[PDB]
Symmetry: D3
Subunit: 308 residues, 6 copies
């Protein structure tokens, strides 16, 4: 199966030590961005994927290109923008809240925010089994929002990660635009959590949010944080619980789960063991700096499962 994602790839600067950034002197570079992470989680389970994204005509842009190409992602439908730089962010870890991370963005007016419907080619989108994007892509600019509408219009099957970021838009704006997108397009997959349900449906309860969402989405993945996740489908509920592991950086974990779940679905996994495997990938993710560098293959997940 082939996944096509639409969004902004970012270069990540991950603090080498925890604490406020004013006292961190070293930063470790990684390639990330939600849809880039989804792509890699998707191929790791043995499917194919491409990303529609625009990067700058700079080192960070070519870094993102080389990294994803090396991972086996189809990068041939990416664009290079000569008049705008690649977006970046910094990660401050475990401060002021232990176990949590904070993203600090330098993405405004980036090459990535300049993604437009003109970059969404019907001939390519038609080749996909699933077209995926996020609330991040909706939020970064109106051209990128337009690009999601275009791709979703073309798409037979649609996947959406809520991925709300209050640093990119108000909670009210986030509610309005997502409800707007869900109104226009019925989804095969909705990936969200209780934090975003609270913003969108004024509803923190996983069972209630999932019921309010069942009209827009066939299969709903409700992430609970460290506790794990619940999948809702065919009038069933299934809770897959998290694991206790050393937390280095949780950034990337929701995408690791999201991407792994979607890929196993297309490998014919039953819903519950797709989630069980997806939780393994997100568990491993929090253990490291880097959103992508220990996304597990199916065999690695199964090794974990034997011993854990």
């Amino acid at each position: 199966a082939k996944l096509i994602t639409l969004g902004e790839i970012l270069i990540e600067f991950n603090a080498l030590s925890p604490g406020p950034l004013r006292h961190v002197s070293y930063f470790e570079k990684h390639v990330a961005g939600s849809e880039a992470n989804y792509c890699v989680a998707f191929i790791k389970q043995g499917n194919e994927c491409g990303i529609i994204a625009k990067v700058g005509d700079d080192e960070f842009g070519y870094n993102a290109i080389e990294w994803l190409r090396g991972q086996g992602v189809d990068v041939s439908h990416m664009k290079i923008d000569p008049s705008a730089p690649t977006g970046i962010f910094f990660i401050q870890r475990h401060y002021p809240v232990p176990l949590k991370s904070e993203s600090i963005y330098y993405r405004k007016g980036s090459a990535g925010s300049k993604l437009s419907p003109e970059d969404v080619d019907e001939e390519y989108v038609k080749s996909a089994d699933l077209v995926h994007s996020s609330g991040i892509t909706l939020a970064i600019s109106s051209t990128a929002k337009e690009a999601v509408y275009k791709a979703f219009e073309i798409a037979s099957n649609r996947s959406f990660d809520t991925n709300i970021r209050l640093k990119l838009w108000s909670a009210e704006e986030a509610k309005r635009e997502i409800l707007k997108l869900l109104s226009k397009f019925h989804l095969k997959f909705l990936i969200t959590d209780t934090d975003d349900s609270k913003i969108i449906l004024g509803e923190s309860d996983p069972d209630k949010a999932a019921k309010a969402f069942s009209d827009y989405a066939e299969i709903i993945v409700m992430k609970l944080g460290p506790k794990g996740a619940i999948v809702y489908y065919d009038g069933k509920k299934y809770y897959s619980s998290g694991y206790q592991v050393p937390v280095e950086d949780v950034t990337g974990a929701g995408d690791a789960l999201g991407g792994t779940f979607l890929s196993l679905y297309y490998k014919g996994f039953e819903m519950e063991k797709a989630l069980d495997y997806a939780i393994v990938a997100s568990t491993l993710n929090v253990m490291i700096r880097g959103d992508q560098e220990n996304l597990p293959t199916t065999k690695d997940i199964e090794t974990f499962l034997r011993e854990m």
Copy 2:
């Protein structure tokens, strides 16, 4: 409110790996010293502070001056000793006792130890709301001890952290000299713990130690290690529990608590709320190498209290 502390600022050489120093090859420099730590913690809560301290005419001494001045500490009452070197120490972490650190001093004949009553200006000391020192300052030299006596004679309100270091003086010396200071000068605040209570009073129980200490102090902070702290004030007793977090280096945690509690008292906090917030400060402290680098602002503490 203005805090004035007297003590020895030290440069810290924190092992980059846990284990016996004989097999650690890399060390990370920080600026520390109990009274320097108290100042920054005090400042972080929106109050003002100065330190009366002597450093060497050397790179480490200017390091200490620049760092503190950068934190907004008043450094205009510091001295530079013409010939004695700035005091330093090394931290061996998690060995041979996990979750604990050991300080290895190179402070004998240091510029810090040459602090004397002649460095204590009377009108400066009158300008403070609270004057603070510790058992460390008493232990390093006769002149430093004298300096603390002079400051405490001039002070209207006095604070003292027992901070007993058996590497600097014997248990009897400590009991003697601390008891002598407390008999001479009633305290507004005593900051101590169980280990120092047993050495000074023979008494290990929090309540029994606190009752004895109330002959000398109005408000008693009885620290308990990872379990947290108890404040005793008036006829009340209040326990504030610690949090479970990954432990990097506990060095500094007691000052993080002490200094934060003190600052919040002068911001008008109830004793229990001031202790609660102070526990947050010392919790974040144990998570990092460096005694000062992740001292939180009041806002940071509240963020922690919400998302925790």
Copy 3:
């Protein structure tokens, strides 16, 4: 004497290894920005300085403040911008050209670019012996350009580093705006080089460039890169050669020279000797990553001269 400078403080991310950034994974943080660099170089010779700059209400903003305050720079006339982020930049070293570096900016719509006439206190500016800015400040925004005009309108004596950055503006607008400034305001000091001389006057010959510039500036420092610099004053020229040293990062060397040179002038140094000493400062600067970290005191320069 007191220097006041106007410009944008930047946080620097300096590659830990040479080469194209797409293959560099580790980045080291420094506090930089031309006017910030001038400030520190000026105080290192024992004069006073302040900076009029705007930073963000973010970790990188308070980093800039703490660092500059620690260095003894007057920071009380800085502003904190509630909405825009602190400007940042990356350094790629020795690639594709050995011994050279290149700055990669993320400063568009930064807090620093939102410096305006409103941030320039008239009484504060009157307090300076020398008011200093550069071509970077002119180029970053209209309000920051406006701010320099205001400052220069009030100033008794003016200093200007041409500091042309062709990533910030075109050669023609650099030529036009610099000459517009020079014709409106006579300078006590002009700091430039043969590169910027080519752009502003078409003149690559340092003597002819100086002759052209002498209508606008009393004292002209014409830097020549590795080979040293020339001071033109009193109808005379003095050339001071550079030194051959291992080159880590040349970034900041120009500010090291200009700032040190200015400060020694006010210290009563004879003109040509003041340039000799400033060359030592720029020499030392190229030997490390960080624009400020090894700025020498007058005594350090003399140790260098004794031994070199």
Copy 4:
């Protein structure tokens, strides 16, 4: 007392971050190999020891010699092979299984594997109080297996750590070769665990495995993983529980326990106390990268026990 071990010394390259090696860029070097771990653990409790091993005529060879010599290990009966390299291995940490590690060997045809009967001096082996080897040594080559047979024939008292590596030989071969060894040579000490018992006897219950092994060994140490260990001696059994500590790398922990236990036995420690202390050594071991760097002295073990 004197321990002589026979085995392959290995240079270890320890992944500086967790995750699959294809995305780890940094490796930290350590001297290891099971019998070298035993030697150092043994010397740390105040007895003497030597190793019979062969290393390459190469930097890694000389590294092992100098390190072991520095630790106080008799290295005079080691051999330098001119035609084969020192064997090495890489450690992949916490991936795919959290808290566990994986060794990736580059040891085939190594100098270590060329250990042979002729390298075993009768006189030297007779000077030992205890002659010790492992399943690793039987598995690496015939010559090394035959070397163990020769030394065990000459030895009065024998010690054996099963140390089964499925990467070195099959379960069936390991079962065959170990049972064959035990049938030929009565052991004073068998050091093993529940995994190796399952392979060798088809029995994973500690007590039943111990009873079955009692035909061949006089004192049986049954390691349980994180849970601790049980010692079987004189129809008696004694469980000594492990400690919960942050796990950096478990590699070496079983040798740290085994060597410390053996040495304290020869120091005249009561059996239960000898195991309590050996558990401290292995507890400390899992806390760092490096099999040998934080092996505790008896004194260090006692400090640990006072506090914990």
Copy 5:
């Protein structure tokens, strides 16, 4: 144009500090091996290429695949070995000879040595414009040598880097196997040096070595180490001098020259200019640890030449 190389891809472990490996504790991982380096230098000048190689079924094997795929090399003719490990090497730098490096191999019976004629597809080989191998491939095994003979029997145009490694065979066998190859297969390009000329022909002088080699090759590149390189073609000689730059690691530089030179020939560069450009690539190569990480594009080479 399309290049096809045949040879062993190796994982490189690069000493982070100079000196004998026995006192170097940290190693930095890179992807290298001569033909792999040629491939990437070839792609950097805008041509296509692929590599015929086999890697182990291990992290280091998938690391090599991802890296090269990421760089744009065709990896579809690479194979995974069922049982043998990916070959690796360590680099000791600047000891005992300043500015020089030493490779220490763990490659015997590697996956890469098991490259064989049955892995070389005739139609793919025939599709290439140039087919290239080295003396390393000839040396590692007879299956690999067989594979080179096969590819060279099929190829219309051939290229060969002598790349003699005395750790892999004797001077005598190198002389014999290379002369045997040259007299069977006429080459379009011979890439070599004065060291290998001495071994193969007993002739160290470049002109006279080139004269003797002209019997087997149309275009001879005679590298000179730091001094640069001479190309001999069509009765002409052209010397292109090296540059003085700080040397971090010269490992990789000759491949960098070779691959860049070959690629620019197919871009229609005049021979002399191709060599000058090739020298820029090798010049930058020596400045970093990593054989591939700062291989320049043609554009980057032009930037170098413009300001140097």
Copy 6:
């Protein structure tokens, strides 16, 4: 042949980046001190050596013991002082003077300074072929001075490195004390340089300084700094020139030369060859941090000489 040195072993904290220590955050540990350095240099040329030194009962003390024992140094005549710390120092590199280093001591009242005649075993000293010390040991304390007097009284053949440290004693005391020692004890070897000659003799010219020193020493090694060294013996003079290498840290270089020269004299080397070889040892020394880690063997020197 056996060298016995008497001195203070120090633990070295080497700055990981150049510049003023106030801005260096990372330090790298090495075992050092002049007589320790001589010992290892002596051993490296295949002779035997021991050291009489007192270290603390601390991690750094045991670090020193293990290191020197690992290098093959006889360590059995060292002492542990239970009441005083092992001495340490920091190295600040390339600031304020390029290519030079400075040592910042924390050695006052160290265990090494408590070296006393009591610690000099008469029997052991009589077993030496050469008993060596330096001006550092005369300067650290009066007991250590007396230790050198005792050992020199017992010895038949003596060696002395002037090694003047103006941070340890005044120019006049250094002159006075060294002339005292030279008058009391005829030296077989005097190792010095033109800086120390200027202080002791008022003479910085090599020939004139040697002429004056010839009344006191049989063989004089006059080090010149980077440009090399001269030997004076048997009415002969021989200058061996230095080499141009990249300089990391010159600390240790004079001891590398000293120790290597002495040891090669005892291998029966001509005086000129011994010096030549010694220069290579000191050339390599300046290229790394660490006084000891790249001391070459005779074979390493021969390789250097072959290529260089």
